[PDB]
Amino acid sequence: XXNXXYX
Amino acid sequence: XXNXXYX
Ligand SMILES: *[C@@H]1O[C@H](CO)[C@@H](O)[C@H](O)[C@H]1O[C@H]1C[C@](C)(N)[C@H](O)[C@H](C)O1
Numbered sequence: 003x004x005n006x007x008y009x
Numbered sequence: 010x011x012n013x014x015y016x
């Protein structure tokens with residue numbers, strides 16, 4: 003993970 | 010804004 007979003 | 014991140 004480590005990313006974010008939101009999609 | 011309203012979206013997220015983190016870049
Ligand atoms: C997403 O990251 C930001 C930055 O550190 C935090 O402020 C935010 O609380 C965090 O969102 C939580 C709540 C959410 C969106 N329901 C998810 O569970 C995420 C992974 O964590």
Ligand SMILES: *[C@@H]1O[C@H](CO)[C@@H](O)[C@H](O)[C@H]1O[C@H]1C[C@](C)(N)[C@H](O)[C@H](C)O1
Nearest residue numbers: 006007008009010011012013014015016
């Ligand atoms: C979104 O990220 C910023 C920067 O780290 C935080 O300061 C902020 O608290 C965070 O927003 C929260 C609250 C919100 C907007 N209701 C959402 O739940 C997000 C994911 O987390």
Ligand SMILES: [Cl-]
Nearest residue numbers: 007008012013
């Ligand atoms: Cl949320």
Ligand SMILES: [Cl-]
Nearest residue numbers: 010011012013
């Ligand atoms: Cl908002």
